[PDB]
Amino acid sequence: MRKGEELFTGVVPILVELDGDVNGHKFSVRGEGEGDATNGKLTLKFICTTGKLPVPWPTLVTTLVQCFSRYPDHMKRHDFFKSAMPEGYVQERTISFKDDGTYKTRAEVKFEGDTLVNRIELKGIDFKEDGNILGHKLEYNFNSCNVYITADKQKNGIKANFKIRHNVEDGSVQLADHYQQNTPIGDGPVLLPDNHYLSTQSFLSKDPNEKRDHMVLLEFVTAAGITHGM
Amino acid sequence: MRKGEELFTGVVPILVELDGDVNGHKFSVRGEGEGDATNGKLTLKFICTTGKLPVPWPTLVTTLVQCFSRYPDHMKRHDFFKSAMPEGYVQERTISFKDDGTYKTRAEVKFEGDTLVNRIELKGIDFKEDGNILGHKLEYNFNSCNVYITADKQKNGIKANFKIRHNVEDGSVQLADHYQQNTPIGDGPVLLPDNHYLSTQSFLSKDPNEKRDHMVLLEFVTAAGITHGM
């Protein structure tokens, strides 16, 4: 219906480009695949194009396109992410690993022709040489509870903070606290939502034929927490 | 693909019939609407046909069709609920309200012609006259974390136990512990899954034009927790 909305009615090609620096360990990640917003479905394959990924793949999942969330019909007015398209939005995080380092991400999510591009810069500091992150001690999997989206009245966008619990091999848990702010890139009307949340299921596999350090990622996202409308 | 699966590829009409007895308070509920398994989407309207519902609508949500879960393609072998169709399955629960009473449900979920029918008997006992349930002190809303499905090797079906946290008006929480066992009605092959879970978003509203005690229910369900396949 809305012009932003209209860009997402089919299957859309995704490109993700991440340049990272964690404690001076430089790397790049490239992802390719597609988003089906009607089904809230993401299929992507990520490659560490620089060799060995110096952090665990799961710590990068949230950083590596919430415009592909399935908003139920009655909640469509609360979908900031698609309203910002095609011009797109800046997404910034601080991710705080408990008793370990901090990631700071600046990404732009926008249309470049036919393709939805998530282009990221990641800077990690004060990582332990043999913590769960630099010492790769995290299980190859991922889950989250509800992620709460709130309006940023001030800067005309959205904010979110949420806790990711990563399984450690010794059977312990590594907390990664996410604070997120998103601002539109363009000056065109956007939708500022009421409080609601996104529910994400995540599936991380391996292509048995891929030799490069990679992640196969399948995701389902559904927005909830608002009944008004209906 | 599978013959059970094939019954759910479109929009299917649902009828739900509940006869209840809580502490001698007899009531019936009738629900009508549709399930779209491809989208994991349920739309139903429930009527208390006997007058005032003597328990809160949210305590009945889990009792009032997990065959409408969206199983991702790679997880289709782990979908017991549709394998049992058309003949269907018996679903039994004990729901234990913390410091209050207990529900016992026996339902049959099966095809009757074109329609998926959930026909239930509910028996509630040892309810407090002025607890959160008989004294209607629960907020008109509903959420759950993951519901874990496990095979019942013994009786050729599935089992689940899960905790529902109902919001109370004083700002407290009422726990309802669910133990679930499902057995196929027929003797035909069924699929016994590996451990996985269902994630449900729930939206409870009112038809502003309905005078009878009712619940409008919209639900999204997605199965996860298995990456093998893909």
Tab-separated table of C-alpha atoms in Angstrom:
chain	number	residue	atom	x	y	z
A	1	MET	CA	0.000	0.000	0.000
A	2	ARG	CA	2.615	2.659	1.240
A	3	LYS	CA	5.423	3.319	-1.355
A	4	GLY	CA	8.143	1.848	1.021
A	5	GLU	CA	5.929	-1.197	1.783
A	6	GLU	CA	5.470	-1.619	-2.054
A	7	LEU	CA	9.279	-2.276	-2.482
A	8	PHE	CA	9.008	-5.407	-0.265
A	9	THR	CA	5.909	-7.220	-1.661
A	10	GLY	CA	8.085	-9.783	-3.551
A	11	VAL	CA	11.427	-11.582	-3.001
A	12	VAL	CA	14.179	-8.865	-2.781
A	13	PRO	CA	17.957	-9.555	-3.339
A	14	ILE	CA	20.161	-8.665	-0.292
A	15	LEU	CA	23.874	-7.699	-0.250
A	16	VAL	CA	25.624	-7.276	3.133
A	17	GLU	CA	29.173	-5.753	3.299
A	18	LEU	CA	30.925	-5.629	6.738
A	19	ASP	CA	34.389	-4.084	7.327
A	20	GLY	CA	35.546	-4.947	10.863
A	21	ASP	CA	38.467	-4.234	13.193
A	22	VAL	CA	38.520	-6.159	16.517
A	23	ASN	CA	41.664	-5.275	18.563
A	24	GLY	CA	43.525	-4.567	15.230
A	25	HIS	CA	42.311	-7.904	13.656
A	26	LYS	CA	40.954	-6.505	10.327
A	27	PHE	CA	38.393	-8.586	8.387
A	28	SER	CA	35.585	-8.320	5.855
A	29	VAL	CA	32.320	-10.268	5.586
A	30	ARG	CA	30.219	-10.438	2.430
A	31	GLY	CA	26.629	-11.810	2.469
A	32	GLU	CA	24.244	-12.485	-0.441
A	33	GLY	CA	20.664	-13.864	-0.576
A	34	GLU	CA	17.066	-12.691	-0.413
A	35	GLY	CA	14.339	-11.288	1.818
A	36	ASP	CA	10.637	-12.104	1.602
A	37	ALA	CA	8.949	-9.491	3.917
A	38	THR	CA	5.465	-11.034	3.206
A	39	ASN	CA	6.768	-14.184	5.037
A	40	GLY	CA	9.279	-12.410	7.300
A	41	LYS	CA	11.906	-14.821	5.778
A	42	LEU	CA	15.669	-14.121	5.308
A	43	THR	CA	18.032	-16.608	3.486
A	44	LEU	CA	21.672	-15.426	3.364
A	45	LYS	CA	25.198	-16.914	2.984
A	46	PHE	CA	28.026	-14.900	4.634
A	47	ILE	CA	31.780	-15.371	3.657
A	48	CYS	CA	34.744	-14.032	5.669
A	49	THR	CA	36.533	-12.841	2.505
A	50	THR	CA	39.815	-12.062	4.414
A	51	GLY	CA	40.400	-15.644	5.715
A	52	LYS	CA	39.596	-16.848	9.263
A	53	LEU	CA	36.895	-14.822	11.018
A	54	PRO	CA	38.606	-13.510	14.205
A	55	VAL	CA	35.313	-13.514	16.223
A	56	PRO	CA	32.555	-16.147	16.387
A	57	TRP	CA	29.896	-15.981	13.598
A	58	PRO	CA	27.008	-15.751	16.168
A	59	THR	CA	28.404	-12.428	17.591
A	60	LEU	CA	27.870	-10.890	14.084
A	61	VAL	CA	24.285	-12.202	13.465
A	62	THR	CA	22.433	-9.068	14.854
A	63	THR	CA	24.918	-6.726	13.059
A	64	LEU	CA	24.567	-8.525	9.645
A	65	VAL	CA	17.923	-5.824	7.814
A	66	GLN	CA	14.811	-5.417	10.022
A	67	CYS	CA	12.888	-4.049	6.959
A	68	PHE	CA	12.302	-7.815	6.194
A	69	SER	CA	10.215	-8.244	9.411
A	70	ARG	CA	6.632	-9.511	8.747
A	71	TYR	CA	4.366	-6.781	10.194
A	72	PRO	CA	0.795	-8.155	10.509
A	73	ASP	CA	-1.756	-6.087	8.512
A	74	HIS	CA	-3.139	-4.270	11.631
A	75	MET	CA	0.453	-3.272	12.650
A	76	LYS	CA	1.570	-1.863	9.213
A	77	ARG	CA	1.488	1.789	10.489
A	78	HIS	CA	4.181	0.833	13.073
A	79	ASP	CA	6.781	-0.387	10.454
A	80	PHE	CA	9.478	2.364	10.478
A	81	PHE	CA	12.036	0.166	8.610
A	82	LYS	CA	10.137	-0.073	5.294
A	83	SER	CA	8.769	3.560	5.593
A	84	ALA	CA	12.419	4.790	5.333
A	85	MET	CA	12.891	3.026	1.901
A	86	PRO	CA	14.160	3.400	-0.725
A	87	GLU	CA	16.552	6.073	0.709
A	88	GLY	CA	16.957	3.865	3.811
A	89	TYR	CA	18.262	4.353	7.366
A	90	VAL	CA	21.428	4.551	9.505
A	91	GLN	CA	21.511	1.761	12.152
A	92	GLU	CA	24.027	2.232	14.989
A	93	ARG	CA	24.716	-0.197	17.870
A	94	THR	CA	26.881	-0.598	20.905
A	95	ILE	CA	27.050	-4.383	21.750
A	96	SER	CA	28.591	-4.936	25.253
A	97	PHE	CA	30.038	-8.423	25.881
A	98	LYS	CA	29.828	-9.027	29.660
A	99	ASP	CA	33.370	-9.176	31.249
A	100	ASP	CA	34.771	-8.831	27.653
A	101	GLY	CA	34.910	-6.230	24.834
A	102	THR	CA	32.434	-3.895	23.025
A	103	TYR	CA	31.342	-3.712	19.322
A	104	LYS	CA	30.267	-0.347	17.785
A	105	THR	CA	28.479	-0.671	14.418
A	106	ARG	CA	27.482	2.023	11.945
A	107	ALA	CA	25.471	0.563	9.014
A	108	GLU	CA	23.404	2.053	6.168
A	109	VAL	CA	20.394	-0.040	4.997
A	110	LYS	CA	19.107	1.255	1.638
A	111	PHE	CA	18.124	0.281	-1.905
A	112	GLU	CA	20.915	0.338	-4.554
A	113	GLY	CA	18.872	-0.409	-7.689
A	114	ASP	CA	16.907	-3.714	-7.205
A	115	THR	CA	18.979	-4.755	-4.141
A	116	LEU	CA	18.615	-4.072	-0.398
A	117	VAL	CA	22.179	-3.310	0.833
A	118	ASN	CA	23.307	-3.416	4.491
A	119	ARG	CA	26.768	-1.737	4.478
A	120	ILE	CA	28.458	-1.886	7.931
A	121	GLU	CA	31.573	-0.686	9.794
A	122	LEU	CA	32.351	-2.609	13.019
A	123	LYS	CA	34.941	-1.582	15.627
A	124	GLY	CA	35.648	-3.968	18.556
A	125	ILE	CA	37.809	-2.927	21.542
A	126	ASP	CA	38.954	-4.164	25.005
A	127	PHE	CA	38.472	-7.857	23.969
A	128	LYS	CA	40.304	-10.441	26.194
A	129	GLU	CA	42.965	-12.460	24.220
A	130	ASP	CA	41.409	-15.695	25.578
A	131	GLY	CA	37.785	-14.711	26.324
A	132	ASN	CA	34.788	-16.531	24.702
A	133	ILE	CA	35.050	-14.143	21.673
A	134	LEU	CA	38.740	-13.887	20.609
A	135	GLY	CA	39.252	-17.522	21.803
A	136	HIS	CA	36.181	-18.789	19.792
A	137	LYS	CA	34.405	-20.573	22.806
A	138	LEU	CA	30.759	-19.984	21.602
A	139	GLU	CA	28.411	-22.719	20.207
A	140	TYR	CA	27.430	-22.276	16.491
A	141	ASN	CA	23.754	-21.316	17.140
A	142	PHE	CA	21.658	-18.249	18.111
A	143	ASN	CA	18.310	-17.328	19.832
A	144	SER	CA	16.669	-14.130	21.198
A	145	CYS	CA	13.525	-13.251	23.163
A	146	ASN	CA	11.376	-10.314	21.973
A	147	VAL	CA	13.308	-7.259	20.654
A	148	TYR	CA	11.308	-4.107	21.789
A	149	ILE	CA	11.176	-1.273	19.188
A	150	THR	CA	10.306	2.242	20.607
A	151	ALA	CA	10.026	5.561	18.690
A	152	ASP	CA	12.901	8.109	18.928
A	153	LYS	CA	10.647	11.214	18.883
A	154	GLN	CA	13.840	13.464	19.093
A	155	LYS	CA	15.677	12.112	15.917
A	156	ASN	CA	12.616	10.825	13.922
A	157	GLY	CA	13.518	7.110	14.073
A	158	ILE	CA	13.431	4.041	16.363
A	159	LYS	CA	15.540	2.661	19.241
A	160	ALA	CA	15.862	-0.810	20.759
A	161	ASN	CA	17.904	-2.356	23.522
A	162	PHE	CA	17.934	-6.129	24.057
A	163	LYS	CA	20.125	-8.860	25.567
A	164	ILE	CA	21.543	-11.775	23.495
A	165	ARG	CA	22.492	-14.892	25.519
A	166	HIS	CA	25.239	-16.830	23.606
A	167	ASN	CA	25.851	-20.483	24.673
A	168	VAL	CA	29.519	-21.069	25.757
A	169	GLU	CA	31.177	-24.524	25.320
A	170	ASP	CA	31.803	-25.044	29.123
A	171	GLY	CA	27.917	-24.812	29.341
A	172	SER	CA	27.993	-21.158	30.619
A	173	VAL	CA	26.382	-18.100	28.882
A	174	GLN	CA	27.911	-14.925	27.413
A	175	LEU	CA	25.644	-11.841	27.576
A	176	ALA	CA	25.807	-9.297	24.712
A	177	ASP	CA	23.791	-6.121	25.578
A	178	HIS	CA	22.538	-4.353	22.411
A	179	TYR	CA	21.636	-0.599	22.379
A	180	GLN	CA	20.339	0.316	18.863
A	181	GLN	CA	19.332	3.716	17.317
A	182	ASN	CA	18.057	3.991	13.711
A	183	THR	CA	17.628	7.369	11.868
A	184	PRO	CA	16.209	7.836	8.340
A	185	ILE	CA	18.824	8.775	5.663
A	186	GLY	CA	16.312	10.897	3.662
A	187	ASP	CA	13.972	13.783	4.703
A	188	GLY	CA	10.747	12.037	3.385
A	189	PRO	CA	7.807	11.109	5.686
A	190	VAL	CA	8.448	8.040	7.906
A	191	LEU	CA	6.249	6.025	10.321
A	192	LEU	CA	7.057	6.399	14.037
A	193	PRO	CA	5.652	3.333	15.796
A	194	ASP	CA	4.057	2.669	19.130
A	195	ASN	CA	5.934	0.231	21.421
A	196	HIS	CA	6.018	-3.242	19.883
A	197	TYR	CA	8.570	-6.113	19.430
A	198	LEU	CA	10.065	-8.416	16.794
A	199	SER	CA	10.279	-12.185	17.331
A	200	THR	CA	13.103	-13.861	15.358
A	201	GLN	CA	13.821	-17.574	14.847
A	202	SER	CA	17.421	-18.173	13.575
A	203	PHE	CA	18.992	-21.256	11.860
A	204	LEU	CA	22.823	-21.278	11.393
A	205	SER	CA	24.304	-24.086	9.133
A	206	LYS	CA	27.389	-24.810	6.927
A	207	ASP	CA	27.610	-25.436	3.180
A	208	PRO	CA	29.515	-28.804	3.269
A	209	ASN	CA	31.146	-27.790	-0.086
A	210	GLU	CA	32.311	-24.284	1.098
A	211	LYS	CA	36.033	-24.123	2.127
A	212	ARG	CA	35.980	-20.375	3.073
A	213	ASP	CA	34.989	-19.453	6.727
A	214	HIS	CA	31.201	-18.964	6.193
A	215	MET	CA	27.715	-18.875	7.798
A	216	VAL	CA	24.473	-20.086	6.179
A	217	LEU	CA	21.664	-18.144	7.941
A	218	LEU	CA	17.883	-18.758	7.669
A	219	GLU	CA	15.648	-16.393	9.724
A	220	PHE	CA	11.873	-15.862	10.358
A	221	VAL	CA	10.757	-12.476	11.862
A	222	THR	CA	7.220	-11.504	13.046
A	223	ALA	CA	6.223	-8.204	14.756
A	224	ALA	CA	3.732	-8.336	17.662
A	225	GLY	CA	2.728	-6.488	20.847
A	226	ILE	CA	-0.003	-4.191	19.326
A	227	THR	CA	-3.693	-5.298	19.063
A	228	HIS	CA	-5.222	-1.775	18.203
A	229	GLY	CA	-6.588	-2.085	14.656
A	230	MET	CA	-7.841	-5.673	13.892
B	1	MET	CA	4.153	-33.249	-0.346
B	2	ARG	CA	2.989	-35.769	2.436
B	3	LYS	CA	-0.814	-36.524	2.275
B	4	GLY	CA	-1.425	-34.850	5.744
B	5	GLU	CA	0.698	-31.814	4.731
B	6	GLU	CA	-1.405	-31.639	1.466
B	7	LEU	CA	-4.625	-30.925	3.526
B	8	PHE	CA	-3.072	-27.671	4.863
B	9	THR	CA	-1.616	-26.015	1.704
B	10	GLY	CA	-4.553	-23.526	1.483
B	11	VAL	CA	-6.816	-21.623	3.926
B	12	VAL	CA	-8.734	-24.260	6.017
B	13	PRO	CA	-12.014	-23.522	7.955
B	14	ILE	CA	-11.749	-24.175	11.755
B	15	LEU	CA	-14.560	-25.054	14.214
B	16	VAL	CA	-13.740	-25.230	17.953
B	17	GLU	CA	-16.334	-26.662	20.437
B	18	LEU	CA	-15.487	-26.536	24.203
B	19	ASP	CA	-17.745	-27.966	26.958
B	20	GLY	CA	-16.400	-26.862	30.358
B	21	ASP	CA	-17.148	-27.366	34.053
B	22	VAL	CA	-15.112	-25.241	36.522
B	23	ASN	CA	-16.209	-25.928	40.152
B	24	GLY	CA	-19.751	-26.797	38.823
B	25	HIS	CA	-19.894	-23.591	36.636
B	26	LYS	CA	-20.941	-25.221	33.300
B	27	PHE	CA	-20.252	-23.319	30.050
B	28	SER	CA	-19.699	-23.802	26.331
B	29	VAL	CA	-17.399	-21.947	23.923
B	30	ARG	CA	-17.797	-22.017	20.150
B	31	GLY	CA	-15.038	-20.725	17.807
B	32	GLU	CA	-15.072	-20.282	14.010
B	33	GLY	CA	-12.432	-18.993	11.539
B	34	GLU	CA	-9.532	-20.233	9.441
B	35	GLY	CA	-5.978	-21.556	9.502
B	36	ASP	CA	-3.284	-20.837	6.926
B	37	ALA	CA	-0.450	-23.340	7.787
B	38	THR	CA	1.745	-21.922	4.925
B	39	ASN	CA	1.840	-18.637	6.969
B	40	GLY	CA	1.389	-20.213	10.416
B	41	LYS	CA	-1.658	-17.843	10.775
B	42	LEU	CA	-4.840	-18.487	12.856
B	43	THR	CA	-7.877	-16.064	12.812
B	44	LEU	CA	-10.730	-17.171	15.111
B	45	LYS	CA	-13.721	-15.632	16.978
B	46	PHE	CA	-14.802	-17.477	20.170
B	47	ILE	CA	-18.326	-16.985	21.785
B	48	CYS	CA	-19.295	-18.132	25.302
B	49	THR	CA	-22.664	-19.474	24.087
B	50	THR	CA	-23.957	-20.063	27.693
B	51	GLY	CA	-23.656	-16.396	28.846
B	52	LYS	CA	-20.802	-14.995	30.983
B	53	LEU	CA	-17.558	-16.968	30.733
B	54	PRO	CA	-16.815	-18.044	34.352
B	55	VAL	CA	-12.992	-17.990	33.801
B	56	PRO	CA	-10.822	-15.413	32.008
B	57	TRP	CA	-10.549	-15.808	28.180
B	58	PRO	CA	-6.682	-15.945	28.327
B	59	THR	CA	-6.777	-19.142	30.513
B	60	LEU	CA	-8.567	-20.904	27.574
B	61	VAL	CA	-6.230	-19.711	24.731
B	62	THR	CA	-3.850	-22.795	24.809
B	63	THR	CA	-6.856	-25.186	25.159
B	64	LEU	CA	-8.803	-23.608	22.203
B	65	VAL	CA	-4.793	-26.563	16.726
B	66	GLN	CA	-0.981	-26.902	16.463
B	67	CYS	CA	-1.424	-28.497	12.968
B	68	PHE	CA	-1.543	-24.799	11.776
B	69	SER	CA	2.106	-24.221	12.890
B	70	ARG	CA	4.413	-23.076	10.017
B	71	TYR	CA	7.141	-25.762	9.851
B	72	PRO	CA	10.061	-24.450	7.731
B	73	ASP	CA	10.798	-26.693	4.698
B	74	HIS	CA	13.892	-28.345	6.323
B	75	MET	CA	11.798	-29.199	9.456
B	76	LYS	CA	8.777	-30.791	7.616
B	77	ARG	CA	9.735	-34.359	8.766
B	78	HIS	CA	9.288	-33.187	12.410
B	79	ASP	CA	5.589	-32.073	11.982
B	80	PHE	CA	3.588	-34.756	13.888
B	81	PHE	CA	0.379	-32.621	13.951
B	82	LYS	CA	-0.279	-32.628	10.179
B	83	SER	CA	1.046	-36.265	9.758
B	84	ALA	CA	-1.903	-37.427	11.962
B	85	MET	CA	-4.495	-35.867	9.519
B	86	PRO	CA	-7.137	-36.373	8.335
B	87	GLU	CA	-8.006	-38.900	11.125
B	88	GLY	CA	-6.389	-36.497	13.630
B	89	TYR	CA	-5.116	-36.738	17.222
B	90	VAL	CA	-6.185	-36.735	20.895
B	91	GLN	CA	-4.623	-33.787	22.810
B	92	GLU	CA	-4.741	-34.027	26.622
B	93	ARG	CA	-3.488	-31.412	29.124
B	94	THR	CA	-3.229	-30.778	32.811
B	95	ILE	CA	-2.904	-26.946	33.336
B	96	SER	CA	-1.869	-26.145	36.974
B	97	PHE	CA	-2.659	-22.595	38.166
B	98	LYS	CA	-0.101	-21.766	40.897
B	99	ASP	CA	-1.819	-21.441	44.366
B	100	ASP	CA	-5.183	-21.975	42.519
B	101	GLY	CA	-7.030	-24.740	40.603
B	102	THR	CA	-6.226	-27.236	37.778
B	103	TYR	CA	-7.741	-27.669	34.249
B	104	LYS	CA	-7.820	-31.144	32.590
B	105	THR	CA	-8.598	-31.067	28.844
B	106	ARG	CA	-9.346	-33.929	26.474
B	107	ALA	CA	-9.700	-32.696	22.852
B	108	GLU	CA	-9.890	-34.402	19.439
B	109	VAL	CA	-8.365	-32.452	16.492
B	110	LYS	CA	-9.488	-33.979	13.172
B	111	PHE	CA	-11.011	-33.245	9.765
B	112	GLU	CA	-14.848	-33.403	9.514
B	113	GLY	CA	-15.291	-32.895	5.758
B	114	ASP	CA	-13.542	-29.610	4.674
B	115	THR	CA	-13.207	-28.338	8.285
B	116	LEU	CA	-10.524	-28.798	10.969
B	117	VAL	CA	-12.467	-29.405	14.233
B	118	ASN	CA	-11.005	-29.050	17.755
B	119	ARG	CA	-13.642	-30.650	20.055
B	120	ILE	CA	-12.744	-30.252	23.775
B	121	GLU	CA	-13.929	-31.267	27.265
B	122	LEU	CA	-12.514	-29.134	30.120
B	123	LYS	CA	-12.822	-29.941	33.836
B	124	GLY	CA	-11.552	-27.365	36.390
B	125	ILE	CA	-11.289	-28.173	40.126
B	126	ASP	CA	-9.990	-26.701	43.439
B	127	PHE	CA	-10.360	-23.091	42.110
B	128	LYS	CA	-10.409	-20.335	44.828
B	129	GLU	CA	-13.762	-18.383	44.886
B	130	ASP	CA	-11.769	-15.106	44.738
B	131	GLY	CA	-8.481	-16.122	43.061
B	132	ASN	CA	-7.248	-14.471	39.793
B	133	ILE	CA	-9.329	-17.034	37.780
B	134	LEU	CA	-12.843	-17.274	39.332
B	135	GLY	CA	-12.556	-13.561	40.352
B	136	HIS	CA	-11.501	-12.488	36.772
B	137	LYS	CA	-8.251	-10.563	37.845
B	138	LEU	CA	-6.199	-11.305	34.632
B	139	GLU	CA	-5.341	-8.713	31.896
B	140	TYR	CA	-6.945	-9.404	28.444
B	141	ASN	CA	-3.679	-10.404	26.657
B	142	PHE	CA	-1.379	-13.451	26.254
B	143	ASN	CA	2.317	-14.339	25.496
B	144	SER	CA	4.522	-17.482	25.695
B	145	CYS	CA	8.215	-18.309	25.253
B	146	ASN	CA	9.176	-21.359	23.149
B	147	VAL	CA	6.916	-24.446	23.555
B	148	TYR	CA	9.249	-27.567	23.344
B	149	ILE	CA	7.755	-30.556	21.437
B	150	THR	CA	9.407	-33.996	22.187
B	151	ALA	CA	8.473	-37.431	20.740
B	152	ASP	CA	6.468	-39.897	22.912
B	153	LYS	CA	8.242	-43.048	21.630
B	154	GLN	CA	5.969	-45.209	23.965
B	155	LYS	CA	2.499	-44.014	22.615
B	156	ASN	CA	3.555	-42.919	19.052
B	157	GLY	CA	2.874	-39.183	19.516
B	158	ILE	CA	4.334	-35.983	21.030
B	159	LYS	CA	4.515	-34.382	24.502
B	160	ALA	CA	5.159	-30.819	25.659
B	161	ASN	CA	5.314	-29.062	28.989
B	162	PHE	CA	5.548	-25.263	29.187
B	163	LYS	CA	4.764	-22.397	31.577
B	164	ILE	CA	2.286	-19.584	30.711
B	165	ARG	CA	2.777	-16.328	32.680
B	166	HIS	CA	-0.601	-14.451	32.843
B	167	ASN	CA	-0.472	-10.727	33.829
B	168	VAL	CA	-2.618	-9.995	36.965
B	169	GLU	CA	-4.251	-6.537	37.475
B	170	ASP	CA	-2.318	-5.772	40.762
B	171	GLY	CA	0.818	-6.075	38.466
B	172	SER	CA	1.655	-9.642	39.720
B	173	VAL	CA	1.855	-12.835	37.546
B	174	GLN	CA	-0.189	-16.060	37.588
B	175	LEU	CA	1.729	-19.177	36.456
B	176	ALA	CA	-0.167	-21.888	34.516
B	177	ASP	CA	2.008	-25.049	34.090
B	178	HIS	CA	0.993	-27.035	30.967
B	179	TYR	CA	1.750	-30.802	30.598
B	180	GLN	CA	0.527	-31.960	27.127
B	181	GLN	CA	0.392	-35.469	25.506
B	182	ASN	CA	-0.920	-35.993	21.941
B	183	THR	CA	-1.690	-39.486	20.459
B	184	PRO	CA	-2.837	-40.199	16.874
B	185	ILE	CA	-6.537	-41.242	16.544
B	186	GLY	CA	-5.832	-43.538	13.534
B	187	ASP	CA	-3.302	-46.406	13.019
B	188	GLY	CA	-1.698	-44.815	9.843
B	189	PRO	CA	2.012	-43.814	9.679
B	190	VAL	CA	2.867	-40.601	11.605
B	191	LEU	CA	6.055	-38.491	11.933
B	192	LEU	CA	7.811	-38.618	15.325
B	193	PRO	CA	9.947	-35.483	15.591
B	194	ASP	CA	13.286	-34.651	17.094
B	195	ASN	CA	13.248	-32.037	19.901
B	196	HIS	CA	12.126	-28.663	18.561
B	197	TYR	CA	9.808	-25.770	19.665
B	198	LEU	CA	6.926	-23.599	18.452
B	199	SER	CA	7.020	-19.801	18.770
B	200	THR	CA	3.551	-18.188	18.953
B	201	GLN	CA	2.589	-14.498	18.791
B	202	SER	CA	-1.007	-13.898	20.074
B	203	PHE	CA	-3.378	-10.892	19.570
B	204	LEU	CA	-6.626	-10.814	21.652
B	205	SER	CA	-9.269	-8.118	20.689
B	206	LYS	CA	-13.068	-7.462	20.918
B	207	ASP	CA	-15.642	-7.062	18.144
B	208	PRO	CA	-17.126	-3.654	19.220
B	209	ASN	CA	-20.498	-4.835	17.746
B	210	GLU	CA	-20.563	-8.236	19.613
B	211	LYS	CA	-22.770	-8.250	22.786
B	212	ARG	CA	-22.043	-11.934	23.709
B	213	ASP	CA	-18.930	-12.652	25.939
B	214	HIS	CA	-16.342	-13.257	23.143
B	215	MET	CA	-12.633	-13.324	22.158
B	216	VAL	CA	-11.195	-12.286	18.774
B	217	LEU	CA	-7.866	-14.178	18.454
B	218	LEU	CA	-5.141	-13.666	15.797
B	219	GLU	CA	-2.058	-15.950	16.095
B	220	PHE	CA	1.265	-16.524	14.207
B	221	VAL	CA	3.158	-19.835	14.858
B	222	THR	CA	6.658	-20.811	13.571
B	223	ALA	CA	8.589	-24.022	14.450
B	224	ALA	CA	12.357	-23.766	15.086
B	225	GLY	CA	15.202	-25.438	17.005
B	226	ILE	CA	16.386	-27.884	14.235
B	227	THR	CA	19.035	-26.876	11.613
B	228	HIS	CA	19.742	-30.478	10.194
B	229	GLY	CA	18.525	-30.416	6.579
B	230	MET	CA	18.924	-26.911	4.974
